[PDB]
Symmetry: C3
Subunit: 228 residues, 3 copies
């Protein structure tokens, strides 16, 4: 933007008319060129710093990007548009339910910027009944819907049933019949229920498939409800 | 910024020169002090509200942080730089492939702010062949590379082979030989393939290690490709 | 904002006083109405584009939201407050420790916007001792505390011990005693240690419960420490 410098008036009153014309059209041009919304063109770095004036800038020198840089008392020339920061919460330690004994870090945390909740846990003992509640999350922690996740269990036990068929030849010698039964013996392994955690829409964490006395743990994170 | 107040001219034309000097240097000083980029120093709260003027402010009173606050028709004094919000998408329900029957919430969702995709599922029945496709994700959902994750399976079956060595003493009585064979019997448990989900670069979810008829499920999330 | 248009002075010097009054009060009103912080009311779209002037706007036409839009050399009319973008890092491939052989994509990545680290891996061979280190993360990757997660293992082996009770009737015929022992035989399945990964506060990934020679893998992500 052009800077207006006032000019010395003429020496006698007779020549005051053209002088007023020129000076007034100059000031009018400056006022219009400023009032249209033209702060000027970004130029070389500014002069003495003082809080109250903040000249915008082009790429690079004052700031990496173009825009309207603005300094302050600290005089750090804040970027165009200031925001201190954003940060999630802290890991809230929760007392286990159903008399479960913590085997490590069993905590939960928000992430509002993520719209999620992250939970780590490792417990032993307590009620191992399927569907037993280990943690009741507050309403703000409620998932949008029912959810299931795999869970770690120190014990993954199986059941084995052994079947001994009757001897093929009942008239065979007892040693031969026993050997035939033994050679034709079979073993069937039962279904093993993998440890899993089920979280409902009301923020209740339930265990299923976890054997009694098994060190059960896991770390995970799940999205929250939509955040209007 | 200083406010310029016009002054009354003198009473007679003879003394018009010094008056013009003073008033013009005053207006020139004001115009330069404004055109250098000095809106002024942030001060006590402003006066009557009207859309069109938006005075910036210091920390605290008008807004928690310094900067250029700007109100509007609603007159809420928006922070320096306005942005409505950002929000991820909704959980898209997908029809299971390979004739799999959903046992619960089987959905997937974007998170563009996260550059990730979050998928929950729980299914039974259908084709349990290793490498069978259960969901073909669209191209925007494609992971950067091949990926493998553990999967929950309601059935974790094992195989057991029983071995009966021949009697140590063939000349022993048949009861003794049978007892020796029985006491020297051995059992070997086979390898159990843990249920796992494999997602490729083309967004195809494949099952492996999941037994036939086993309720297989899991909830997880994975980062997307880099988003230029 | 009103635009000031300079006016023609009167024809003779005698009538110069009221003219100065009117023109000076006009320019003073304009200067005050501009210096109070009133750029004007957002109006219909602006006129010839040139770098240096950037008129703000109302909702819709120039930009979807209200505010102070500002164009540039490219003349794209950047939104009120400019920011190029934010983006996470790349997946850093890491050489497995303990002579582990990679079976696929074994990489790790930062997410500073997420304050998290995402790791995928699939390895075979090497040292399968519990607590063996497979990757030592740098300090910036250190989790806030100790953490445990389930791990996928291609082998989930069990141990089975078979018990043969002595015959109920020692005076029974040897065939009957053998049949009674066989029918009263029992099988006990041992505890199976599920594969799991433990990550400590110093960024060391340890394996536990993974059988020797088992293809062990998994993909996961964990939050980092709080980022001040």
């Amino acid at each position: 933007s052009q800077k207006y410098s006032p000019s010395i008036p003429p020496q006698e009153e007779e020549e005051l008319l053209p002088f007023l014309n020129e000076e007034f059209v100059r000031v009018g041009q400056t006022l219009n060129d400023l009032a249209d919304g033209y702060w000027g063109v970004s130029m070389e770095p500014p002069k003495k710093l003082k809080p109250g004036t903040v000249k915008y800038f082009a790429p690079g020198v004052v700031g990496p990007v173009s825009g309207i840089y603005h300094y302050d008392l600290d005089n750090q020339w804040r970027l165009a548009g200031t925001k201190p920061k954003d940060l999630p919460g802290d890991f809230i330690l929760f007392t286990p339910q159903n008399n479960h004994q913590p085997m490590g870090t069993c905590a939960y945390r928000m992430n509002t910027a993520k719209d999620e909740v992250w939970i780590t846990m490792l417990m032993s003992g307590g009620n191992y009944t399927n569907g037993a509640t280990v943690l009741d999350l507050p309403q703000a922690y409620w998932p949008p819907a029912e959810l299931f996740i795999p869970a770690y269990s120190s014990i993954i036990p199986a059941q084995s049933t052994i079947t001994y068929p009757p001897p093929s030849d009942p008239n065979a010698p007892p040693l031969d019949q026993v050997f035939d039964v033994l050679n034709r013996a079979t073993i069937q392994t039962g279904v093993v229920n993998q440890a899993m955690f089920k979280i409902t829409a009301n923020g209740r964490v339930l265990i299923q498939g976890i054997p009694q006395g098994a060190v059960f743990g896991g770390t995970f994170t799940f999205p929250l409800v939509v955040t209007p």
